[PDB]
Amino acid sequence: DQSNRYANLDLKEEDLINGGRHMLVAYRMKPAPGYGFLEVAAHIAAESSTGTFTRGVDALVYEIDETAFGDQGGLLKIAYPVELFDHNLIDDKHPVSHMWSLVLGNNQGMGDHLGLRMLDFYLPEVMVRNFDGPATNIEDMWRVLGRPTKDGGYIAGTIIKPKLGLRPEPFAKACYDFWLGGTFIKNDEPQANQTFAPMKKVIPLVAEAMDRAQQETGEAKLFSANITADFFGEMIARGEYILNEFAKYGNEDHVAFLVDGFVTGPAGVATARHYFPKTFLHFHRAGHGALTSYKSPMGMDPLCYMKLARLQGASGIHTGTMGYGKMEGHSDERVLAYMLERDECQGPYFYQKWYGMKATTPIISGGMNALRLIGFFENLGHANVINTCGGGSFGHIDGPAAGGKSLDQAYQCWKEGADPIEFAKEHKEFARAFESFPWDADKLFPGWREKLG
Amino acid sequence: DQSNRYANLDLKEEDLINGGRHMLVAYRMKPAPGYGFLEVAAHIAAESSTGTFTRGVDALVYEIDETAFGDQGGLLKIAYPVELFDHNLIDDKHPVSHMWSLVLGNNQGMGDHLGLRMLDFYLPEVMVRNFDGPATNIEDMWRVLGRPTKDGGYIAGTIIKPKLGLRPEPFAKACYDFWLGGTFIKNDEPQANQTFAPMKKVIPLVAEAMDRAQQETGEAKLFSANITADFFGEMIARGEYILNEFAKYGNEDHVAFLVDGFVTGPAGVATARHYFPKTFLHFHRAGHGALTSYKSPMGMDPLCYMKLARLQGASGIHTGTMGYGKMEGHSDERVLAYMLERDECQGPYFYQKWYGMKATTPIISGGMNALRLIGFFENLGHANVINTCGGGSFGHIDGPAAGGKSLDQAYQCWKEGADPIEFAKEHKEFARAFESFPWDADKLFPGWREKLG
Amino acid sequence: DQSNRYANLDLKEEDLINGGRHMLVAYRMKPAPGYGFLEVAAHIAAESSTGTFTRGVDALVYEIDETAFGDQGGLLKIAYPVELFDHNLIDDKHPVSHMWSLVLGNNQGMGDHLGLRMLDFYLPEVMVRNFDGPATNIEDMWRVLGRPTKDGGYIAGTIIKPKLGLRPEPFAKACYDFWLGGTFIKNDEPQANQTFAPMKKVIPLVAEAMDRAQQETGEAKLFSANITADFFGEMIARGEYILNEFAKYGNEDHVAFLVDGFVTGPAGVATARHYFPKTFLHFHRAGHGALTSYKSPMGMDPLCYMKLARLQGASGIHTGTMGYGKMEGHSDERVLAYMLERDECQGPYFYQKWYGMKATTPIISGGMNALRLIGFFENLGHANVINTCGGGSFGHIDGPAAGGKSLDQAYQCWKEGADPIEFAKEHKEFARAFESFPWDADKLFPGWREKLG
Amino acid sequence: DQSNRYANLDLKEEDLINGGRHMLVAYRMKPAPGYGFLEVAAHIAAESSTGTFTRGVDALVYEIDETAFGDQGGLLKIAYPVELFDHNLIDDKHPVSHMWSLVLGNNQGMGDHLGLRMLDFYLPEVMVRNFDGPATNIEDMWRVLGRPTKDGGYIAGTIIKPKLGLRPEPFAKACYDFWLGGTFIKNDEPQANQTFAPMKKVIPLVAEAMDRAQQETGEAKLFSANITADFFGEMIARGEYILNEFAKYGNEDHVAFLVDGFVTGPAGVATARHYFPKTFLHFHRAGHGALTSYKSPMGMDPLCYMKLARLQGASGIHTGTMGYGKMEGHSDERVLAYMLERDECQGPYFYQKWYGMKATTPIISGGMNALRLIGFFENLGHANVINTCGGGSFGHIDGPAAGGKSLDQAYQCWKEGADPIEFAKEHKEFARAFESFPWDADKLFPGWREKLG
């Protein structure tokens, strides 16, 4: 019924993009029984904007394909005038929370559709330049590690098992054991200040373990510490406490902050981004599946969530192993990494320029090991990632330290374009990964058994 | 496979509840093809706790009914030791974000189920007493309005149309026009500091409109102002600016703060709750449908979201018209209101005591009017609600002020247990609501035409 | 030399005051050898404003009396255009820090005077209405105590001895012992989180002592807890921690916050005033003597410091016993109390209206006891003060609880206009104060020995 | 009377220092008539500590010289057990405010002395390591300027005249004019957000002037922007706003923050130090004369104030021209610079180690010019200072840009150990400073007229 006002299917998407005055959003939408696709689409545009000088700022349906997705619905595109979006009193920037409240707010509760899912969105220059974006990313880690800041490459990481329940001294010992070979360690997403492992007991022991490993290896080590909380004053207290403990050893810039960004919401990410901009903001997505799982016809696709994380200021975020590990996996998920790290990236429906906004670094995890990293790097096109390997490190038959080394050595091998089996003859930890995971070696490198003994 | 460790189906739920040492959660879960219900359930418990002294804090599957929901899956219940939950350094309280990250975190991304949905949860005394809870609710509005703080009753509200796009002077004029009869006005959820209606232009005009209406009517008026932002410093700036503008007229405690709590996340709600505890925190759910819509097999049921909002400190939150307005509606949704406002409430799977935690006030909206309010009150059992009526107020044939009066008069009629038609003979605005909405009057009060002329 | 620009002795002070566009300041100034009084005065005006459209905002010397103070110098008055003063981005209010930086900033370091002291200042309406002012004062304590909020009267307090060094349990015990008779207890100004009495050990014991005393007496008790710190995040952590501990007993609004406002500076007072406005801000002046002692020819007179404390938002501040206790004392210091608590007050050089800005409550201390309070009240004209008595309470021969009662009973006696000796016959604790301090009784009430036995 | 408890003149200062368990303070004190020097000294120790397990933490008088200062009093030294000092809940560090409240708090108001002045103090290692200290100093400016971070040398600055009153466009133009030759510009201490030059009008113009000057010169420029306020939320708003405006040109790390630290107090400095640690904190002392002027027998000597500023985290602070400019001046004030910038420094009574705490950079100002800088550098021993020259820059007969160059060229000449007159033959701006200030050239370089024409 509102299609006359809130729909203009004669608008051309290219004119909307070249004009630079609209945010565009593509959705998958399924009309409820009795309702027409255009009528529901126009209703969505109204609910997502002026709900009805007002004409100039109406959101407009400009494209529909009612049959695009068969029994899962059709394609819907809406243009949002940039004047709809809010501005901080302090710095005039757009809140992410506010943008979300328009393009995916009340329209998620409507009764005249059976599903409404964001697939992609386009931000014009005037909007992109008005979000925080990241302040820190892997480039700052490369600097702390003594690497080039251009293509400093791969950072070998792990997660400690059991992920929750270890008392303070056993946790610090596991950190030390790995840091004798590996580089990066993170808290588990709900590991913080439980009574059985209080923050102010475990953090001093971890700082001491870092110092010991660094003195014994001569190599710099990194720790990502959970500061998740609801209250900004608490997250400030956690971060300041942690940085001061690491500062007692000269290692304050070896600390990253883990923030469970989905369960805090954008406001919690913004607390860390604004108060601690120069501390790497490690965005943990725990819980995001409720919003982004393909099993839901609501919410948004993972690529959209990635774009929003970069705008909020994530220094790094989990992306996935892209079919080379042990999760949901296709080599074609590389677009999630590209959209996070490149200055420009083609998305499923919109080409996105980032106009110099800093990259968000992909954090790879999901049953990866040294043998698998070669194919993973080759598919991605680079190795500028952080990688947490649970079994790929502690599952090394020579121990977690050897596991960590075997991961670094996988990066060297790829970087050199060397033959993995020939490379292994001169690099023991990589060679011993073949024996640690021979099911994978038999597959990827048939013949290794004879060539390596 | 992990069922031996992470499942104990011999545990009795009543023993877990009477013991007071576990949070319990009920889920609807559908196993993926090839996986057994118990195996997946145990995997969920592991992923949601210790991921594997550790045995004492494992989450445990204690009840399953694999066929409870037919093709939508089965019922799964998990017990979480209270020792799993985090504690603020500052005040030892539990973060809501953290609790969410365990009971509905990584388990939302697992590949061995086709759906995992929270239906209800149980907090024992030791946990309930360790959340913020609300600091302010309708009782504080009753005080400002000169009402009894016991059963002060109904607050007549409206929303301004168009909800977004009005320039500052037309918006303030609409506020004045309604406040000559009604009491409560709110911003629209994305209405804030747009260039076409800057905060520092519209807020002074609204404060002036309140003052004028209060001087002309002798009655106190209320305004709920949007302070949504990502950054705590910005939300502080907005709130302090707004309170100071209303303070210039002596009306600072006539201000409530609207916070789009789903798109800010719990951290944004906590900013308002901690910095502005004595300013009514009006929680707007815009976007929550992605998490709570019944169209998704992920996320959580609305009742769970309501419980979480109270723990975070919402002073009020939208619940719905419960089948008496024009939305998704059943009289049985009254449990959402009861769980928000009562000191104790039976939920779908767990009885919940709140141990003196303040109520969160239901904010009713969705095509309500004066005629309909009688049946709505009778079903709910009380009228201690805030109610925003768009058409029920501005749709009054005598204008928004008359509409607002007709809503108050509906409360009086119910409160008096009077016959609505007899009551209308002595209350003109209520009587004129019959003519404003005669389709409803013909239905609810057949005969009114003759008795009222 | 700059007298032609920065001096206009033809300006009339009454015209400057009635115009409402200037802050005026009176100083005592002593020229250095070789310099003329007017030349130095004009230099001060230049240094305190434009240092030289600029003419419209120059500060102007409008009155001088070179011989007013003999060998201590002369009188100097300067008019500051209100346009010179700063405005917060957030709420447009004047920072106290900024105002201080102009009227008493670089002019304190000049080499062409041997002394420059602020004696008084005048704020016009447009400025007074643009400072924070207090949010809380004794009226809020009266409410918590179940008193009338009009002239609720005297609050009997004490300080614990030794003021610093008591371990947590002995300190809480002393609090309990006094609270069985008295009402108000404060931390000592440097008593906070020392290793020998950690905050998180002593505060729970004090909260428990309050609860016990309140259950046993049926009377409400008050505690003023030190939250002094440099860092706003720490002061927030302290205040939230303390309020939560008292909230466990339902006594959160029985807490006041002590802030060492001179050593934090105005910024620290503002942290408490903005974050915790509804918690009584007990301003402790420790260290102010460097700025306000009459032994210095620099700085400002105590009356000026009092005015600044009210503008910053002190709920109460120490004033002194005004010659009725054991300190620097003259009955004429009552102007310090009047300037803090009245809506209008004559100062030494300027009449000051406060335009409804809340009172700052006088906190009396300095060797007062029940016998002395009568004359003190009569001189002041009221008893709306908080009073901490060290010896007047614990020095009671029947103990601190009896001492506290004897102080309340002194207020009752004055309030009743009763004869103190006749009153004592029917009030045992007051009567026993005569025996506790007979040197004072012999003086003030000759004959008591016979009439009371 | 309390000398038996609070005095132990048999203690040896060297034992107290080598033990590392006491802060020591030296004072000048004058007893009031009738009081003995030791009795008053012991009273001061009591008032400054336990006011009376308590014995172990008493402050102790360990040295007195009653005649040390003739009619100005005698010397008094007091030892403070480190256990007396407070600890943040967050990071366990000592608040400066709290330390001040003990060693120079209530003892400033006592009636049994006619003066009590801090001359020096000693912090042992355990205390020094427990203060914030600076996070940023001139080394970070050297990095932004492309200089070595070791001895990067002199930064040529100016102040704009008139210091207060310029509208936004004329102020930005003056900044541009100077930046074509000079490097560093600062706001005046009370210049901020006045109605005649609003922050959000002038700051964008200054950022644009920086960009233009940098594009035209190819050299990096620096601006120190006033963020002084009482309220931490306002100072955050100012700083974030300013950094974002400079970030629009890629110049966010070209910004320093000016904080009027005396009138905000330590709490305001801490806000900037904690929220903006990596932005150079330019501490402006406006008003400190009330506390540190030698005309007062109260307060503290400038050297003490300098030590406190470093502990609070000042990146730089004004010291003075040390007799080479036009102020209070003696070459021997170089100790103020040495105590701020060295890792170890002898003070008037105590040798102070800083244990790696970052330097606070001296900011030199007070009628300096290029000719005078040579002798100033030679006396100081280095040129690692920031220098604001009002007349030494704009007073150059060829303009402010030429003036700024002449200052840089003075540094080069000193650095080269070259003869100033010979150097001038090959450096025009330096040569033209001789003509700009020939009174100084005739004095310092007799003969220049003939050698340079």
Author numbering:
A (entry chain A), B (entry chain A), C (entry chain A), D (entry chain A): 2 to 53, 63 to 463
Authors' description from the paper:
Ribulose-1,5-bisphosphate carboxylase-oxygenase (RuBisCO) is not only one such enzyme where biological function is predicated upon oligomeric state but is also capable of adopting multiple assemblies. All RuBisCOs are composed of a core dimeric scaffold with two monomers arranged in C2 symmetry, which is requisite for forming the active site and enabling catalytic activity; however, complexes from dimeric building blocks can assemble into higher-order structures. Here, we investigate the diversity and evolutionary trajectory of oligomerization in form II RuBisCOs, revealing a trend of structural plasticity that underlies the interconversion between, and innovation of, multiple oligomeric states.
Previously, RuBisCO has only been described to form dimers and assemblies composed of repeating dimers, which arrange into dihedral ring-like structures around a central solvent channel (e.g., hexamers, octamers, and decamers), with previous work suggesting the existence of a tetrameric assembly from the organism Sulfurivirga caldicuralii. SEC-SAXS-MALS analysis on the S. caldicuralii enzyme revealed a molecular weight of 218.3 kDa, in agreement with a proposed composition of four large subunits of approximately 50 kDa each. To better understand the oligomeric state of S. caldicuralii RuBisCO, we solved its crystal structure at 1.7-Å resolution, clearly displaying its tetrameric assembly. Last, the dimer-tetramer clade is composed of dimers and the tetrameric RuBisCO, providing a glimpse into how nature has been able to evolve and innovate new oligomeric states. In conjunction with our phylogenetic analyses, this observation highlights the unique assembly of the tetramer, as its early divergence from the remainder of form II RuBisCO precedes the innovation of the hexameric state yet remains maintained after the divergence from ancestral node 9 into the remainder of the dimer-tetramer clade. However, RuBisCO dimers within an octameric core are vertically aligned in parallel, whereas the S. caldicuralii RuBisCO’s central axis results in the observed angled assembly, thus precluding the formation of form I–like octamers from form II tetrameric RuBisCOs. This further illustrates the differences between the evolutionary trajectory of form I and form II oligomeric state, as the geometric differences between a pair of form I dimers and the form II tetramer suggest the independent innovation of the tetrameric state. Ultimately, the tetrameric form of RuBisCO exemplifies how the structural plasticity of proteins enables the innovation of entirely new oligomeric states through the recruitment of surface residues to mediate protein-protein interactions.
